[PDB]
Design a protein around this ligand. Structure first.
Ligand SMILES: Nc1nc2c(ncn2[C@@H]2O[C@H](COP(=O)(O)OP(=O)(O)OP(=O)(O)O)[C@@H](O)[C@H]2O)c(=O)[nH]1
Ligand SMILES: Nc1nc2c(ncn2[C@@H]2O[C@H](COP(=O)(O)OP(=O)(O)OP(=O)(O)O)[C@@H](O)[C@H]2O)c(=O)[nH]1
Ligand SMILES: [Mn+2]
Ligand SMILES: [Mn+2]
Lengths: 477, 475
């Protein structure tokens, strides 16, 4: 049976609120989360990360922040609709939402704002660059089978030792997980291990969009084929997610009920924003666009009601038709959505597919846009190659470097090690300290956390900072 | 007597929603406003406009990130006012039982839009505009003016000259915000939403000494001579007395007062002007009291942890105080006549903020880098104005000819085209309305032509204004 008291969990991991709390008391807990997220540097960093078009000095353009802000509005509208409908259906009290009314819309809003928090500089091409670079170091293709003699993996510790070990399973997991960087998973890593935000279990649940472990090697089960689409969390966060699952009464590979809303909100916001920016950047006129789109109720109607006015009314019409649909879909499939087992999105739609198609054919295909995707990949690929010496080091050597911060045998490695943000470096120390040194899997775990350290640093950079750092360290600035 | 149904007005200026509406129907009206504002280019432009420190390559606050943080304080205050009103059983009594959401939504959007009308280099962009216009049409004399039409034998027409001369030298971001949401952006927001962004009630053209009764509300200019008619309708629509403020503005104001410096001290430590320790010391220098309760308490938890707990403590003391102040003075606040802020001087609470202001003034705003940017900004805007001076130099017939057939004026034409269509349209729209036969027609035209230029400049982002200066300087 459906009881949102069981899902909207107002407890925290560390220094947790306990006891019996008033409707107001619980409200203030969730309002504290809002403050944490809004005043977070991780969120301020988004105004420097780019959405589609590069950041200009004529930049009426959207950034990851302005877009995330617009998604937050869609999410609010959807949640507000789900609740207004549930109230009309007299189900609000029946589902336990009568007192958790505000936290419900607040969780959705903050999950929307945070939905792009772990994306790396250059987005899909920053992801590409990281995975491709790590793939060429520790070949995960080789670990799927039995320990091969020509194991291409360069990391001596991570090479599969010849029919000898179940320790080989850790190697498989480490090799695959490190080649499966995903912004979604990095977001969980970031909110927990890195930013140490200490959000409520319910708030963290909302940003777990996928349930596939990064290290996953097989083909996802038919039952959860959709929820396991992309990796949702890393091998480092395995334990955290395992508690989150317990705290939110989630089955294995089940999603948090509210995530379907943030997802739907994201689906609506996807292109419409970027077509508005394409007209601004002058790729085409509002007229030219109306032609490529060429349904009557949304697009034609908005054209009749010039530049800002068309998009203001395209957005309105789109929302006024899609928001109620998503809200209805959610209520209609609430049993499965509640269990976290529902294997579809709220909009599984043709109107959105139309916007996607026009944007793909005439905006994401633009030479300027495709030349930043090429450049971005070069930058991140370069950056990784610059810090390669840290991963090249032996455990004893790297350990020595972490201990007496400045080492004389390694001048370059020391200097590069200091470049890494203290927040990430701390997380390494903290994680590696927890492991038992005597353990045979200790060197395997250390290398994993050392790689994770580097991935954390790079993904943590803003688009511009990564570009600068590349040019500075290339000795061209 | 206090009935928020009368103040939370969900009607629009153009193609207005009409009739009897469900709680849900009214909700969707106010949610449409949110969408309009959030997806507005005027709001996206804020991430390019600077709050204190220059825009670097990143963790620093821009006008947008700050406005976003104010929005949170405003939400917290409004949410408190409503939780308290509910406990007092007054929610139904004040008509707020159904307008519960629009109440917190109006506060939130008025917070995001406080700063929207601010020109490129803030108080220095304001400075540059007013000083430039002051040296053209001397308003001191109307209580030297180069504009032949605007120079004062006799005439009551002279009163328009006085109004035009003072109004043009009294550019204010707050007033520009009203101009921008109405005439320029043409956002078609609800009357209630517009009410929330009218922070001051003084007409820009005002020359006298503000009446003692409204001395505070008339602190700075709240609206221009061009928006006179608009405000007159807004006043009617929101049942506001002359020079009275919208009830909810006191909340956005209080939210703004709290957010003021704390943000910038956090950024000063980031930019490495001082250490958290150095800061704790200067705060001590400036003063079991509120001080121990907020600052000392936050330092103990830490020795980001310091600022996280400074913010929390500050808010947990100030938010309920503001909420209480608002409920306590609700009759006057509702009438719009209340002549104080929610956190006014006397209070120990106000003194905590004054402390943050003092530390930031002495060690942050006084920073050479900060001051360099201020000097530079003034130079840019001053320069930019001087670049477009030829448009204001033109005779009415000549300028009119230019607006019509978009040859004798190559430079003026080209400069006229540089002006954003949105502002140029607003000029045409405004000047078209005026009766040509009228003797005050040339006076009105010049006013709108000047307003056109002020709109263009203030409309620029910090960076765009800097670029445009260097481009037009042929560098
Ligand atoms: N430059 C560029 N941008 C794109 C392209 N396709 C989509 N986008 C934009 O980039 C984003 C890509 O969306 P997703 O792939 O869903 O990104 P995401 O939501 O973080 O990924 P998921 O969370 O896994 O869905 C969208 O928000 C679009 O604005 C493309 O081919 N090129
Ligand atoms: N660079 C700089 N920034 C300052 C200084 N004093 C204040 N600020 C910043 O400017 C912001 C706004 O200051 P105000 O001009 O008083 O307020 P406002 O938001 O423009 O609105 P009103 O007071 O209603 O006109 C503060 O929150 C600070 O971030 C200063 O001397 N230099
Ligand atoms: Mn997105
Ligand atoms: Mn301010």
């Amino acid at each position: 049976q459906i009881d949102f008291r069981k899902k909207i969990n107002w407890h925290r991991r560390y220094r947790s609120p306990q006891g019996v709390k008033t409707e107001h008391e619980i409200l203030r807990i969730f309002e504290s989360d809002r403050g944490r997220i809004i005043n977070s540097p991780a969120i301020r960093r988004l105004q420097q990360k780019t959405q589609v078009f590069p950041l200009e000095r004529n930049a009426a353009v959207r950034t990851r922040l302005t877009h995330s802000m617009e998604v937050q509005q869609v999410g609010r509208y959807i949640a507000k609709e789900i609740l207004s409908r549930l109230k009309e259906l007299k189900l609000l009290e029946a589902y336990g939402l009568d007192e958790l009314t505000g936290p419900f819309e607040s969780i959705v809003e903050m999950s929307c704002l945070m939905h792009d928090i772990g994306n790396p500089p250059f987005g899909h091409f920053g992801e590409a660059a990281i995975n491709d670079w790590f793939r060429q170091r520790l070949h995960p293709e080789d670990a799927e089978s039995q320990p091969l003699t020509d194991d291409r993996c360069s990391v001596a510790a991570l090479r599969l030792r010849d029919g000898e070990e179940p320790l080989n399973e850790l190697r498989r997991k480490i090799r695959q997980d490190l080649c499966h960087f995903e912004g979604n998973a990095q977001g969980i890593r970031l909110v927990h291990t890195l930013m140490r935000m200490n959000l409520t279990w319910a708030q963290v649940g909302g940003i777990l969009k996928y349930t596939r472990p990064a290290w996953w090697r097989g083909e996802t089960p038919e039952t959860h084929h959709y929820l396991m689409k992309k990796p949702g969390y890393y091998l480092s966060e395995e334990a955290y997610i395992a508690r989150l699952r317990k705290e939110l009464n989630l089955a294995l590979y089940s999603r948090f009920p509210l995530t379907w809303i943030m997802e739907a909100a994201d689906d609506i916001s996807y292109c419409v924003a970027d077509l508005e920016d394409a007209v601004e950047k002058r790729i085409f006129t509002v007229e030219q666009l109306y032609h490529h789109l060429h349904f009557s109720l949304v697009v034609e109607n908005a054209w009749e009601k010039t530049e800002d006015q068309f998009f203001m009314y395209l957005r309105v019409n789109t929302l006024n038709k899609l928001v109620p649909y998503a809200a209805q879909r959610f209520i209609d499939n609430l049993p499965a959505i509640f269990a976290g087992t529902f294997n579809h999105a709220l909009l599984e739609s043709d109107l959105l597919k139309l916007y996607k198609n026009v944007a793909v054919k005439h905006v994401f295909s633009h030479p300027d846009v495709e030349r930043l995707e090429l450049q971005g990949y070069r930058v991140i690929s370069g950056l990784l190659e610059i810090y390669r010496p840290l991963l090249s080091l032996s455990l004893s050597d790297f350990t020595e470097l972490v201990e007496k911060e400045r080492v004389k045998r390694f001048p370059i490695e020391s200097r590069l090690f200091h470049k890494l943000s203290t927040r990430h470096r701390l997380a390494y120390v903290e994680a590696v300290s927890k492991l038992p040194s005597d353990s045979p899997e200790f060197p395997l775990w250390e290398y994993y956390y050392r790689c994770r350290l580097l991935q954390d640093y790079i993904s943590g950079m803003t688009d511009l900072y990564a570009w600068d750092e590349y040019r500075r360290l290339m000795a061209v600035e």
